[PDB]
């Protein structure tokens, strides 16, 4: 429920810890004409699946700086050997060294790379921004535009989907098969309902808006009903609804 990426309906929480997925939670079932078949997640005979930890998905600063120096030396060599032949660097030779340098190479190809060059003292401004905005900035030290993206979560989320058994198992935990949707490809979510979005501003009271803010929570609980509303997780007497 927690470590499912938000597109698949989960919360998409990043885990800097050690959370084991019980093996009994990696099994799903599918009904074909011959009958109902059951599948497990992995042929591997190991311990219960561990969700990938964010620890291994951040490159250390020492490696970051060594890689940045090597990439910038390579880029300087390429630029100096391309000035002579008079060709602009056209994103083709700068593909292996894409997200390596600390002033990420993506900043060289950024759309507003000309107007950013006149933005000076941006680190100090970012640090001092805490005295103007009411919200503390976790990235008070770097600027995405100027410095680029210094972390990639593509591999982490890839391995988190892989560890959970994939979309098939994750949706087995959900009501997806209860919607009778033929496939998971051509589908999309809607963050707010028509009345929910139209009610974001209609001159409501504190109680009314406070109650209205919980609708996405209701949708989230409904999406995860076959898993949250289970006997094992909530031990005790079960009550059936009236109808």
């Amino acid at each position: 429920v927690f470590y499912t990426p938000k597109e698949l309906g989960g919360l998409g929480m990043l885990s800097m810890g050690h959370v084991l997925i019980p093996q009994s939670d990696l099994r799903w079932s599918k009904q074909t004409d011959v009958g109902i078949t059951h599948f497990r997640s992995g042929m591997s005979h190991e311990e219960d699946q561990l969700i990938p930890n964010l620890y291994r998905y951040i490159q250390p600063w020492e490696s970051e700086f060594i890689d940045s120096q090597r990439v910038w030396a390579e880029y300087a060599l390429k630029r100096q050997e391309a000035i002579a032949q008079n060709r602009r660097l056209t994103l083709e030779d700068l593909e292996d060294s894409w997200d390596r340098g600390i002033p990420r190479i993506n900043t060289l190809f950024q759309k507003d790379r000309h107007t950013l060059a006149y933005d000076k003292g941006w680190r100090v401004r970012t640090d001092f921004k805490q005295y103007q905005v009411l919200k503390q900035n976790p990235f008070w030290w770097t600027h995405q535009r100027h410095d680029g993206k210094l972390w990639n979560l593509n591999n982490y989320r890839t391995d988190m989907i892989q560890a959970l058994g994939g979309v098939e198992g994750i949706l087995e935990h959900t009501l997806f098969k209860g919607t009778y949707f033929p496939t998971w490809e051509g589908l999309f979510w809607e963050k707010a309902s028509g009345f929910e979005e139209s009610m974001k501003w209609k001159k409501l009271t504190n109680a009314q808006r406070s109650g209205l803010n919980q609708i996405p929570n209701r949708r989230f609980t409904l999406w995860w009903s076959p898993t949250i509303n289970r006997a094992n997780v909530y031990v005790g007497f079960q009550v059936q609804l009236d109808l």
Partner: peptide, 22 residues
């Protein structure tokens, strides 16, 4: 299988930080 998050102190020291990333 408890569902609680375990502290990885004294754990997974056989792995670096630059692994599992291209």
């Amino acid at each position: 299988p408890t569902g609680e998050v375990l502290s990885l102190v004294g754990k997974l020291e056989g792995t670096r930080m630059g692994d599992k990333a291209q």
